């Protein structure tokens, strides 16, 4: 019931967001078996070493931990313009 709203609408939103100016990283290549993110550092002979990607545990921003249960409201507690009288701009 919900799939057309994903594939035929939300996917377009991903395709555009992917070209946004600030989405500068390559997040994934679609191959779980081999994909590994590119890893850069600011670094100097004076000995500074700043990784761009660090493992720092939960942060104040709250973006770090992932509740996968978010999957549930989506499948069974959300309307969409394509899925749901049924015309909607």
């Amino acid at each position: 019931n919900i799939a057309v709203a994903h594939t035929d609408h939300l996917s377009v939103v991903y395709a555009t967001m992917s070209n946004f100016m600030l989405n500068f990283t390559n997040n994934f290549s679609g191959n779980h078996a081999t994909f590994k993110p590119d890893q850069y550092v600011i670094t100097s002979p004076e000995g500074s070493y700043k990784p761009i990607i660090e493992r720092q545990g939960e942060t104040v921003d709250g973006l770090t931990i992932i509740d996968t249960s978010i999957v549930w409201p989506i499948l069974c507690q959300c309307t969409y313009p394509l899925v749901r009288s049924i015309m909607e701009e």
Partner: protein
């Protein structure tokens, strides 16, 4: 005498408004059956055919 055009149309008295059909424009047209989704407000109309 004086008839200008004689057409063979679907019969309004049988395909009545009770069946949803609207024969006035020379084709059957039912309102909210197979509406397209994801399109602008005037774009449903051809599906009415």
């Amino acid at each position: 005498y004086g008839a200008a055009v004689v057409n063979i149309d679907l019969n309004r008295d049988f395909f009545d408004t009770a069946t949803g059909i609207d024969l006035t424009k020379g084709i059957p047209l039912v309102q909210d059956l197979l509406v397209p989704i994801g399109v602008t407000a005037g774009a449903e109309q051809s599906a009415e055919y």
